[PDB]
Write an enzyme that holds these catalytic residues in place. Structure first.
Site: not given
Lengths: 306, 302
Positions: B40, B130, B219
């Site tokens: 990358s 999360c 979510h």
């Protein structure tokens, strides 16, 4: 001994399923009558190798039948069930209309078949909501063993009203408690069937964007501790329930299996709280569950009261 | 004062979200370094009106950086965090890898900002999952007011392919999930452990159900709370409106920023509280939480 039977709402999906269930369960039908509005009149169905023609309910002589299964919506039951009852027919009603009537039994045959005796009050027995049927079948063995203090339950169904075959909301203004009018109805159905005003029921009725079939997540607060392993054993023994313990290997994964069976899984205690039990309950074919409950009522009615 | 910041895992989705949150929150960045593997290297991103080039972590001099935000997977944090820490970098790790270590703090700034102090142990701070972040911000006011004895929570993924399978009710029977011996998945237990750590309370019972069917927009989480003293859903609805970052919804159509709805007591049991919690971008929540830690670090420790 054979009985004359009517299905009202015969061209609807539940009504059509009722005919199939009567056939599959080998109900002792002498003559079957199929009723609907004038627009459906003349349609033909095959039942036990014989042809049955839908006729207009407005012209029907109810003296012809012993038992009627109604599934054409609540307002038509409101109108027509009293008329059938007056003629001496016993109506098994698959709508919400008569479920909350004090004098009318609301029956899940695995749970409160004794209530069927009260058919003679009004010549009507009410078929509960498939959500309530599903949950009550699953919970009854737990109730019996250790009692139930509180049920918290979440039900899941499509926003569109489709998916009921699986094979292809208003805040209650009286209660003013944040629960919806559908949610309160589940409370009242649950307490009636258990015949236990002390059981607290806290439902959340959730609509999902896209959904085939019906599911419920159930938490129960029991009056005595009980191990998840014990309740899994009980449910495995109980009739009408298919328990899924989980697969360690591909060949152990199973399909729905039953026609109208209560599919139970993810059975576990609250951690360090064994008077808390959790399970999920699924119906793949929602209509077949409703139709089957209704026929099971008729089977017991015929057996013990005719 | 401005600080040198590295993002490790810069080309991953969380890494990119961290870049965006650092910019949106106007973090005092001197130099931003973006790190990934050999492959990358040479990729470019825009940050604070500048072009920043991704470079190889193997050739990177860590002594340049004050703070690093990691989100390249557990094994890579396991490899690189002790290396960065040794070089004097404070690592805020987004993975689950360090979350459960006794000497590493697991921080939600709305809940336990005090725990940041423990960064001096190993120069590592752990960012929670999360979904745990989402739940704990909603439960904190309730915890403060009346305490919490037990949490039962269901987390839902957001919306034959997986798309179709996620629409089949039969899949709510979890035949192919791997369960620990107590009947709960690793994922679900991680939620238990994170919650107890963050509240710093070994007595709070946590019972998570983490599902991939059914699915909702955004979510969603469904929470039942068993409190240490009774509280009215209206009191609770008041608190959640008077808490910043939380948005309250009324009406029976919910699930329909962090959104909170269907707030009600268990019937005739006011030490039971029910609520839904919905986050629009739960990944951005995680990134924001990590940057919030970095902010308190800068303000209170540097």
């Amino acid at each position: 001994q054979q009985f004359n039977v009517a299905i009202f709402g015969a061209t609807g999906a539940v009504g059509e399923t009722m005919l199939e269930v009567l056939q599959e369960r080998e109900f002792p039908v002498d003559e079957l009558f199929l009723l609907a509005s004038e627009r459906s009149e003349g349609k033909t169905y095959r039942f036990n190798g014989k042809t049955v023609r839908v006729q207009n309910v407005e012209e029907f002589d109810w003296s012809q039948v012993h038992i009627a299964l109604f599934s054409a919506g609540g307002e038509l039951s409101a109108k027509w069930a009293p008329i059938a009852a007056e003629a001496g027919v016993v109506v098994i009603d698959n709508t919400s209309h008569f479920r909350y009537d004090y004098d009318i039994p609301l029956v899940v045959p695995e749970v409160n078949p004794e209530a069927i005796a009260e058919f003679r009050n009004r010549n009507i027995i009410a078929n509960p909501n498939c959500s309530t049927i599903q949950m009550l079948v699953a919970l009854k063995p737990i109730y019996d063993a250790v009692g139930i203090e509180r049920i918290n339950v979440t039900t899941y169904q499509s926003v569109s009203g489709a998916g009921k075959a699986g094979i292809d909301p208003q805040i209650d203004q009286f209660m003013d408690n944040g629960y919806t009018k559908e949610e309160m109805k589940m409370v009242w159905e649950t307490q009636k069937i258990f015949n236990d005003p002390s059981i607290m029921v806290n439902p959340t009725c959730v609509r999902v964007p896209v959904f085939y079939g019906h599911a419920e997540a159930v938490h129960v607060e029991t009056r005595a501790p009980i191990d998840a392993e014990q309740v899994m054993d009980m449910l495995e023994q109980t009739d009408g329930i298919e328990l899924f313990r989980g697969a360690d290997f591909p060949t152990q994964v199973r399909d729905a299996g039953g026609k109208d069976h209560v599919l139970v899984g993810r059975v576990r205690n609250d951690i360090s709280h064994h008077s808390g039990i959790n399970l999920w309950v699924v119906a793949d074919n929602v209509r077949k569950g409703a139709a089957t409950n209704a026929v099971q009522i008729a089977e017991l009615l015929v057996r013990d009261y005719f």
